[PDB]
């Protein structure tokens, strides 16, 4: 009825398989599924429940800007995540998520920067998870 109401994954309960079950990405995905009231069970074998398969993930880092002296100015971290949704009713629906961050480089504080990078990576993983959960909507329809 026209204007703003509060609502918004219909369907719940799924299986969760991953190449890296104990990795940080899998933890973020679990936290996010848990935040969306999705019960993650141990069944397999006798499926008749949708499954979320994390195929793998890759990280990247390139220079995206430089100063006048040729040294790097801004660096960009990239996270790619490939997933698959298997619903027993029909066929498999593939998912992909790409997340980006940017930070300035500093050769005089390298260690600090490394630390920063780690933080960023953490955040990125989390963000990936979010998108994944939201993309389950696209899988529903």
């Amino acid at each position: 009825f026209n204007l703003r109401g509060t609502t918004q994954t219909e369907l719940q309960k799924l299986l969760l398989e991953s190449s890296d079950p104990y990795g940080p990405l899998a933890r973020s995905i679990r936290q996010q599924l848990r935040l969306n009231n999705v019960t993650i069970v141990d069944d397999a074998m006798r499926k008749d429940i949708p499954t979320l398969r994390i195929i793998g993930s890759s990280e990247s880092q390139e220079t995206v800007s430089i100063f006048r002296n040729g040294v790097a100015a801004e660096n960009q971290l990239v996270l790619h995540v490939q997933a698959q949704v298997l619903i027993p009713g029909h066929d498999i629906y593939p998912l992909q998520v790409n997340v980006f961050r940017t930070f300035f480089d500093n050769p005089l504080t390298a260690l600090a920067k490394e630390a920063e990078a780690e933080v960023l990576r953490q955040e990125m993983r989390e963000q990936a998870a979010q998108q994944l959960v939201r993309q389950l909507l696209t899988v529903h329809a």
Partner: protein, 543 residues
Amino acid sequence: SMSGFLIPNAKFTSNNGFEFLLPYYWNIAPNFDATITPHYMERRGLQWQNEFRYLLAPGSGTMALDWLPNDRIYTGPDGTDKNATRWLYYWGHSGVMDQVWRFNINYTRVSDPAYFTDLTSQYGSTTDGYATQIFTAGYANENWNATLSSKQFQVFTAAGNSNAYRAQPQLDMNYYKNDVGPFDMHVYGQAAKFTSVNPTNPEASRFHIEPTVNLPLSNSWGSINTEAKLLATHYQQDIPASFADNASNPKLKDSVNRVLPQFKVDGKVVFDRSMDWATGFTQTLEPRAQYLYVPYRNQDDIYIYDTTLMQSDYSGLFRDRTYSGLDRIASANQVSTGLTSRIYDDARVERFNVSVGQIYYFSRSRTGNTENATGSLVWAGDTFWRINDQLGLKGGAQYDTRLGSLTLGNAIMEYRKDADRMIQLNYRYASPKYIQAAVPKVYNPDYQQGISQVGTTASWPIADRWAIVGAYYYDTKAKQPASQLVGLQYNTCCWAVNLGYERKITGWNAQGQTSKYDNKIGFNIEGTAQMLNSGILPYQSAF
């Protein structure tokens, strides 16, 4: 099965003259590879490039050794070596063995600061200011994990390498536990040893424990989360006498205790509606608010080891930390608010998205006494738009009143059909004052302005079996090209032939300003992306 020679390649560079590559492939085992490559350089000498790839249960990896015996150009860092040996060693490894063991190696070491300036490698570039040397081994299961690490860096300036701190070793531990009553609990711990080459600089052992209790309330619409955290840190700082008797050095303390409680409450709500004239589409409205409080604690008696100013984008608005590492915990007393609108279409595809957020400070953020004070001081926004199935647009901007309005901004648009057709526009801006604040020791515009870079990249088919690629990056304030790349490709029944030209900023002339450029024009056969991914600003596919 492939153990032969590989078809050679050649090129012509403005600094090494004629160059000739003659690769040889070994194939030792199904899970072992080697490549030995004589690399002739007209003006410099004969280099040998060795690459060894492996795949094992602890993970996959690549080692590399480049060796150039008699360099006829280099002289020395000191200006006088003559006939010196150039060398590079690289080791990369990544793997998860038996699901619970985790191994990661990122090691690079070179013979001199001017290596990547003079020599071409896949493991470095002229943009690099240092080399990374990191080893990591750890255990992890569902409930907890631990990680032992060695982090060291080879900075390409005497000063940088001398004052660059090392983490040797670093121990990181995490313990998780859900459903502890109504709460989720998480404990994080760290034990690190920081040392540097310069004997004057202090050494330090840092221990850190950080328990966190969380009350998460979730729903179909919106969610709220209350979080109590305890930051406890002990420092053992060994301070040389030479350091303590400096007219400009801070009075560090031998033993330091820092205990800071942190309170955070974060809530989010999701409204939505069916758009009016446009039927089938859905617009969502998502407000978000977070209060953060951390009491002030003077930390001037602690030195800096692994701590820098974190860079905040729209997401970073809701980050509870201002700095990296653990040497500075800023006091907090602030509300971060944000609004996110989305648009979905017929097929539940997110086609448009916009976010604007802000930070309101009730009191100044402090870490010490070494000091435009309160209110709505930080703003940030980002946006995304899927114009059609092949065209995408996105961008972001950041404001800080304390640093004079706009600090960072960037936008990028990309078209792509398959992997033959691609166009990409982009612009990047960073204020001078922002660079002076976020990353010191590379300050205001003393020849080093902010960033204002316009960029284009493309890959398009033009004939029956022809293909062209391009990449132009331009600095608008200095009014000069930062990087430039033009390329042609030829295809026949077989595969492809590639021809390419490249001109990039590679150095700086101290007298009478101006930048130092370098030229490259070469041929290989053995394309497109492989040529797009070769410059100092390699192509990264957006979206």
